[PDB]
Design a binder for these strands. Structure first.
Ligand code: MG
Ligand code: MG
Ligand code: MG
Ligand code: MG
Ligand code: MG
Ligand code: MG
Ligand code: MG
Ligand code: MG
Ligand code: MG
Ligand code: MG
Ligand code: MG
Ligand code: MG
Ligand code: MG
Ligand code: MG
Ligand code: MG
Ligand code: MG
Ligand code: MG
Ligand code: MG
Ligand code: MG
Ligand code: MG
Ligand code: MG
Ligand code: MG
Ligand code: MG
Ligand code: MG
Ligand code: MG
Ligand code: MG
Ligand code: MG
Ligand code: MG
Ligand code: ZN
Lengths: 81, 122, 60, 193, 66, 135
RNA sequence: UAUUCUGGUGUCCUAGGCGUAGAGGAACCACACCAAUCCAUCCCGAACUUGGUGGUUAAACUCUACUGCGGUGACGAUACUGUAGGGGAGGUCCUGCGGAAAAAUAGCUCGACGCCAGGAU
RNA sequence: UGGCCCUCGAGUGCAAAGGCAGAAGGGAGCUUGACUGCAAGACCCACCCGUCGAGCAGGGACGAAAGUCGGCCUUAGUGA
């Protein structure tokens, strides 16, 4: 009949990208369903929020054959120029 | 949908293997039971390595106990023992039990209990 | 209406002002469907005072 | 006009021997030879016989359900299972979980025994009988026959029966074709066409 | 078989036919008293002859008159 | 008059018309054809009229394929209606055609009768067009 | 120390799948058969369970092979576009410098790599 | 009720979207973590609110154990 009701955009989507840095607890992705799957060193929440358990570079991977999963790997910073 | 018993047990083994995971401090205790033979392994998944493996195909239990058709409860207990000693000598105490698709019962159950009385923790 | 707020209360709690370290009457609260299940709900739940899981019944 | 039930009536006999031992002794060599199989295990075997009562008006009155359960029991020596309807159906006045039919599965030795009390006992005692249709196979080698009323079996006592209740019987065989399955049944004494 | 829920299956069932025939079968009862079983039923031969031979109007005419 | 039998939402976007249509380019049915030169919006009434004209002028010649069809809805607000309080009522239906697109295919005549018939067809079209022969 | 084979067990991945043809029974894996005190079926020793037999590669799995299906997939070109302009009444067109598909065909594909036990050389 | 072929097209209390096949879908057994005390760090952000949570202690539930459990596949169901 008469339209015009709607919703504020929920702020979902990738918060930290591939090869950026994460704190422990830092939220990597807010999603509705699971458009990503938890990998290693990485926990998943009730709303399927994915968060880091470890400081380090976050890397996305083929879950296989089709889907995707995210996991966090510890990096090494020696190379100070 | 696989109604071949084989494929079915593989299904259950994978389902169980979802939850239980071999780590350096808590290796996976892996039971395989075939018709003429009982085979058991111990795995660290992170390093992708088996530390100790005991089976009815080894001369120890071969010269100890012989059986007619299927592996007996007795066979099982002898194996649980063998692997308990084998692992306690490499410094592995605390491990996780992979029932490898089979219902925990019968010679699986007895396998477990034999490994427990002998100083293996699970 | 047909779905109601119910108070659970520890049965073994004595309102007399007990002599222990922490004194108080545990109550939880929750909802029941008064039609579906007319039986007075009983639930085993934790009590901060008794320190053990006790049985919490209801109040009218 | 060809009689393979002159095999079934042949001499004073025993049960186990009849079905299972005439299978191992006689049937298996016969089939092994006439279809020329390159291994023994390719022989057609009888897997299972499920007997299925279809009564949906029995959901209304549970006593008919209990009665027919007892009937199918005394017939098959096995206390039946009561099958629940999966979906809510309008025109049949059915909702989910409502008890519709009555089903038993017969396996192992009871399979052979009930099969025997079928061909050699109730089938001839039936109402006017010509032969069971050769055309009732499913193409993959499993056969089905209806029984319009259950007074067929003597375990069923006809004066004590309140109402006539129908049965369906489904024979399941490892056979992949109907020829092999048909030879299997007939060789075992079945009255075809 | 699960115990006590099933009706008792007596493995020995003597089939007694009134032609004094005694065979063995299986069933809940010990003895079955039978009339008209597989062997000793019209089906094989007698019924074939009755269904297939019952026509013949011309000879039926000639038997009356001739 | 051509038109879709059902859609969920009544009202639709004007859209935007760009490029070439590479797909409808070929002539796969008949012999001679009418090709759309320019980016436009064909009402079902125009296709109707063009087809009727080509059909009547051909007559004794056999066959006319209509290679297009008006599946996108179009909406209008009434007269003396102040702007606001909702999108209007769909009146008619259009087909979106881009340059290179084939409209009419025709078979069963000499090239002369076909050139003339296709001309009378292109007279009821909103757009510039072309005459082409099968390969 | 090698190699080869069986069974277990995993990680990587281009997700190695279906089909057709062939090989495997000494060992291993499997089914087959038999009997039901541990446990077992909303009915059924079918499954799952304990204990026997010694049958068979039929099913299963395993291994070699093949493009028929399936899966994968360019180069180039074009569509589109970033920025600098131009034409058209407009719908929209065109140029220079930079990026660059989808589709389709050419090809590619019948997985790779590791530990353990157990034979063989 | 029996069987063969397609393989995710059903389902998920209710809209729609995103998820989810040996599963988040269907069933069975035992249960009350639909707990107390908290909490590094994040996301969202005018403010007020709102969301995710590794981890610690107490006292438990299921489980042989490993472990999982601070309501519900997620997002509405509310009011300073
Ligand atoms: Mg939104
Ligand atoms: Mg949680
Ligand atoms: Mg065995
Ligand atoms: Mg007939
Ligand atoms: Mg251009
Ligand atoms: Mg297109
Ligand atoms: Mg014009
Ligand atoms: Mg590939
Ligand atoms: Mg490849
Ligand atoms: Mg084979
Ligand atoms: Mg190909
Ligand atoms: Mg292809
Ligand atoms: Mg290129
Ligand atoms: Mg440009
Ligand atoms: Mg410009
Ligand atoms: Mg360019
Ligand atoms: Mg370039
Ligand atoms: Mg590309
Ligand atoms: Mg491509
Ligand atoms: Mg290879
Ligand atoms: Mg819905
Ligand atoms: Mg959906
Ligand atoms: Mg579930
Ligand atoms: Mg913890
Ligand atoms: Mg926690
Ligand atoms: Mg705790
Ligand atoms: Mg306990
Ligand atoms: Mg749930
Ligand atoms: Zn208390």
């Amino acid at each position: 009949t008469k339209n015009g009701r709607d919703s504020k955009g929920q702020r979902l989507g990738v918060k930290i990208y591939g090869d950026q840095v994460a704190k422990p607890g830092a939220i990597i992705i807010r999603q509705r369903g699971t458009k990503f799957h938890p990998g290693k060193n990485v926990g998943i929440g009730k709303d399927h929020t994915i968060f880091a358990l470890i400081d380090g570079l976050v890397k996305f991977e083929k879950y296989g054959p089709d889907k995707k999963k995210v996991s966090v790997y510890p990096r090494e910073i020696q190379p100070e120029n | 949908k696989a109604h071949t018993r084989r494929e079915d047990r593989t299904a259950r083994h994978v389902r169980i293997r979802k939850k239980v995971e071999g780590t350096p401090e808590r290796p996976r205790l892996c039971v395989f039971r075939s018709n003429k033979h009982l085979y058991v392994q111990v795995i660290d998944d992170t390093k992708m390595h088996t530390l100790a493996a005991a089976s009815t195909m080894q001369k120890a239990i071969s010269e100890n106990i012989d059986y007619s058709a299927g592996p007996t409860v007795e066979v099982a207990q002898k194996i649980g023992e063998m692997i308990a000693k084998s692992c306690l000598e490499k410094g592995i105490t605390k491990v996780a039990f992979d029932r490898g698709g089979y219902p925990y019962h019968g010679r699986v159950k007895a396998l477990a209990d034999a490994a427990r009385e002998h100083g293996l923790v699970f | 209406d047909v779905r109601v707020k119910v108070i659970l209360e520890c049965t073994g709690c004595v309102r007399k002002s007990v002599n222990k370290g922490s004194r108080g009457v545990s109550r939880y609260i929750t909802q029941k469907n008064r039609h579906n299940t007319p039986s007075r709900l009983e639930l085993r739940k934790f009590c901060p005072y008794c320190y053990k899981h006790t049985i919490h019944g209801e109040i009218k | 006009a060809a009689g393979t039930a002159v095999f079934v009536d042949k001499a004073e006999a025993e049960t186990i021997n009849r079905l299972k031992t005439n299978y191992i002794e006689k049937m298996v060599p016969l089939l092994k030879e006439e279809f020329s199989y390159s291994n023994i295990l390719e022989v057609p075997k009888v897997v299972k016989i499920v007997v299925n009562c279809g009564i949906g008006d029995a959901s209304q009155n549970a006593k008919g359900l209990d009665a027919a359960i007892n009937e199918l029991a005394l017939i098959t020596g096995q206390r039946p299972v009561k099958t629940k309807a999966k979906t809510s159906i309008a025109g049949f006045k059915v909702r989910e979980g409502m008890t519709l039919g009555i089903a038993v599965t017969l396996r192992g030795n009871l399979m052979y025994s009930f099969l025997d009390r079928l061909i050699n006992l109730a089938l001839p005692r039936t109402r006017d009988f010509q032969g069971v249709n050769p055309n009732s196979f499913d193409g993959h080698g499993n056969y089905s026959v209806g029984f319009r009323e259950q007074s067929v079996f003597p375990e069923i006592k006809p004066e004590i029966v309140g109402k006539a209740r129908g049965m369906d019987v489904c024979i399941t065989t490892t056979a992949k074709t109907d020829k092999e399955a048909y030879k299997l049944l007939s060789l075992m004494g079945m009255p075809f066409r | 078989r699960k115990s006590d829920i099933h009706p008792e299956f007596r493995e020995d069932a003597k089939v007694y036919c009134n032609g004094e025939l005694v065979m063995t079968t299986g069933g809940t009862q010990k003895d079955y008293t039978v009339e008209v079983w597989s062997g000793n039923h019209p089906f094989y031969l007698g019924n074939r002859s009755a269904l297939l031979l019952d026509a013949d109007q011309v000879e039926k005419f000639r038997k009356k008159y001739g | 008059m051509l038109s879709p039998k059902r859609t969920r939402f009544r009202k639709q976007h004007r859209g935007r018309m760009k490029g070439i249509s590479y797909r409808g380019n070929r002539i796969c049915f008949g012999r001679y054809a009418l090709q759309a030169l320019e980016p436009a919006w064909i009402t079902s009434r125009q296709i109707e009229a063009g087809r009727r004209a080509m059909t009547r002028n051909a007559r004794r010649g056999g066959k006319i394929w209509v290679r297009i069809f008006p599946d996108k809805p179009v909406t209008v607000r009434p007269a003396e209606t102040r702007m606001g309080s909702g999108k209007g009522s769909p009146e008619y239906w259009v087909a979106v055609v881009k340059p290179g697109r084939i409209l009419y295919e025709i078979s069963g005549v000499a090239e002369n009768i076909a050139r003339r018939a296709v001309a009378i067809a292109a007279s009821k079209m909103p757009i510039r067009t072309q005459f082409i022969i099968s390969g």
